[PDB]
Amino acid sequence: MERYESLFAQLKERKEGAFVPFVTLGDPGIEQSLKIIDTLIEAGADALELGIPFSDQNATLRAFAAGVTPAQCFEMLALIRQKHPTIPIGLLMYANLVFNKGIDEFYAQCEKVGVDSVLVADVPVEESAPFRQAALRHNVAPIFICPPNADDDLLRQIASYGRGYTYLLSRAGVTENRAALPLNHLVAKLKEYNAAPPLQGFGISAPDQVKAAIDAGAAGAISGSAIVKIIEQHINEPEKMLAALKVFVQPMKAATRS
């Protein structure tokens, strides 16, 4: 019962970084989204970063209310867990949905469907207590974003608070008084303070970029835009969309090996 931990030990032993693709659950549809995720895994994904969309009695237009509901998202999440029992599953989201459902209740449902971690992107690390507590109470790993221009205090806070993995923001992600430092420095400090293994994210869409992150010491990499662009390119060709996704994922994953 430590999916990230188990995963990172297996990867390290094999001298490999982790490739973590990101997709928004339900895009472009529920059935196709599940197939997209299976193809990602079959192609070499070590863990998943899944976005959970949110936007809210009396209807108006089908296009207004349009969207996959949060209940449908957890349902999906449970099927994914059922088909792939050991793959680390992490959610990426904003707080409103968490606030909507209720803090404790939201993490309680993450634990029921087998979600391993949660990154509420818009929550400052200083105002994270209610989220951390809910996370640990339901055996979910609370995730924090480490900015590349973080001072030593923030690095320490993130190191003692995070579990599972630390989300390391690339230099391209910033923007502004303290300069954005090189990945190598941050990786070294995080290790120094015993932070959870770092996964780098933002702007990483090519094999050479993934290789550079792992050579700099990152435990892995995350990528989203390239997958979004592939979906849109074959939005009308579902099967062709899958083949094209497998073609993108293999080189990215290969680049994590040495």
CA 31, 251, 236, 63 dihedral sign is positive
State the catalytic residues: 49
* Burial of residue 35 (number of CB atoms within 10 Å: 0-12, 13-18, 19+): middle
- For this entry, resolution in Å reads 2.3
Under 8 Å between Cβ of 49 and 90:
yes
Pairwise CA distance, residues 128 & 162, whole Å:
11
| Solving technique | X-ray
**What φ, ψ does residue 47 adopt, rounded to 5°?**
-155, 165
Quote the number of domains for the chain. Answer: 1
Taking a C-beta distance cutoff of 8 angstroms, is the pair 21, 201 a contact?
A: no
- CATH number of the domain bearing residue 94: 3.20.20.70
Check residue 224 and report its DSSP letter: -
Length of the chain: 258
76: nearest Cα among 45, 94, 44, 53: 53
Query: Domain containing 258: what range?
Result: 1-258
For the chain, the 3-state helix, strand and coil shares in percent, each to the nearest 5, are: 50, 15, 35
Gyration radius of the chain over CA positions: 18
